[PDB]
């Protein structure tokens with residue numbers, strides 16, 4: 387028992403990290419097979435970042451301008467291309483440590499692990515959620531660009547995020563591995579609206595189920611609610627409206643605990659209306675929304 | 691910017707995980723050089739666990755009774771010995787993935803990463819602290835025994851913990867890599883007192899410094915305090931008494947922010963006496979004590 391904000395083991399991803407330098411800019415790249423993926427802003431200087439013309443900036447670069455180093459091994463760049471906000475550097479050597487992998491575009495509310503890197507070297511790993519507004523609340527400093535987010539299913543790494551930038555609000559934005567930003571963001575140093583965020587209701591309910599499984603049950607009550615009634619409360623408290631699709635994905639947790647999804651909704655409704663009254667749930671004094679129902683099941687069953 | 695409960699990259703440790711089976715019991719082992727380390731209770735059945743005579747139970751076992759499998763590679767056991775609560779199985783092959791490593795016994799209040807494993811396979815990684823009462827609040831299910839805790843300094847892995855058991859209270863206990871339990875615990879299925887825990891004051895202050903660095907400053911006030919006065923409040927709120935050694939280790943954070951350690955103590959005193967008034971600090975609604983001053987500096991400077 388016990389419930390922790392657990393990240394996937396990072397080994398398969400550490401084997402793919404490289405350093406990419408172009409001119410005076412250094413950031414991280416991801417080496418999979420004979421391609422290195424990195425944020426296209428590696429080609430910019432600081433003067434360029436207010437409104438870069440990426441196409442023109444890239445035209446001034448040749449394969450030999452992209453210095454790619456895998457630890458201490460220098461990679462030979464034989465091609466380069468820009469795909470949306472990423473650069474793809476073709477190298478002459480396939481990464482011997484390439485795991486089985488997929489590129490996926492995750493949905494808002496889904497979770498993933500981030501391997502934060504600097505200069506091609508891993509510094510740490512943490513789990514987070516893609517906010518409903520497509521930002522992530524990460525831990526990233528200058529030089530972390532090119533660090534990736536991923537999930538692992540057995541031996542397959544699904545890469546879902548590449549870090550690009552920190553918004554003036556201190557939240558983070560990036561792309562899928564095809565270089566498409568999550569959210570409305572652009573890779574320019576301009577103030578950019580993130581838009582209204584909400585709490586991921588289905589994840590809070592999953593985490594309440596994790597709490598009951600792991601012994602914290604003080605919040606259970608004698609009440610029930612309906613989706614309509616619960617959604618009026620979700621509205622008032624800036625929570626995502628709960629749908630039958632969310633109730634369905636909570637089915638396994640509801641079956642395991644014997645607590646009907648709408649009964650757990652009534653516990654959540656009371657917590658929203660009354661607060662925690664100075665108590666905690668799974669070591670937290672707020673309602674946690676960074677665990678999906680799949681994460682709760684995986685953690686509670688011991689999936690490797 | 692941003693501040694997350696970050697674990698060390700787990701790759702170097704994933705390369706050391708093996709499955710150890712003895713009789714009907716399977717758990718995890720750590721393969722370093724030509725030795726596999728695992729909890730000695732791999733030799734017990736469930737009838738044995740109420741009060742095992744480990745010396746007698748081990749005498750009935752031969753090298754060929756310890757089945758060690760590294761993924762799909764079977765290891766040949768050429769020796770076995772019990773050292774405190776661990777078994778050391780000498781194998782005929784040195785682990786080719788053995789990183790540079792040390793065995794260390796950490797102090798209460800220090801932090802480390804745990805690579806939770808089942809059947810020799812890594813499931814996830816999380817950061818935690820050794821409580822002042824020598825327990826850890828982890829996420830461990832049956833079969834996680836033998837999972838290890840560690841820190842990494844550049845290319846060196848300092849192993850500090852091997853998981854052994856869950857106490858009836860749902861908290862976790864284990865040993866250093868020489869098999870000595872942290873705390874008063876014994877490897878028997880008996881109810882065991884963990885003893886009074888306290889909050890790690892120096893870590894809460896470090897985390898308040900991390901909050902100021904990362905933009906959360908609402909808790910800063912116009913007050914100061916003394917070690918004597920602060921320790922009267924620490925006493926009332928079950929916090930560890932702050933010493934000059936703790937003030938000294940907070941020196942780098944105090945220098946970086948310009949906030950004197952006793953002034954941060956007065957902010958902590960007011961938070962203890964008044965609560966958070968429904969606000970948060972670094973996404974938390976309680977005072978976090980699982981980040982040491984070294985962790986805050988490492989995370990805030992981007993150490994790889």
Ligand SMILES: Cn1cncc1NC(=O)Cc1cccc(Cl)c1
Pocket residue numbers: 427435526527528529530531550551552553572573574575576691
């Ligand atoms: C400070 N930091 C944290 N995580 C990433 C960074 N770096 C940046 O934000 C640099 C940057 C500035 C404008 C646009 C873009 Cl795409 C990138």
Ligand SMILES: Cn1cncc1NC(=O)Cc1cccc(Cl)c1
Pocket residue numbers: 387731739830831832833834835854855856857876877878879880
């Ligand atoms: C449930 N669990 C979680 N983490 C470890 C376990 N397994 C155990 O606690 C099994 C066990 C029982 C008594 C003594 C000992 Cl040393 C071990």
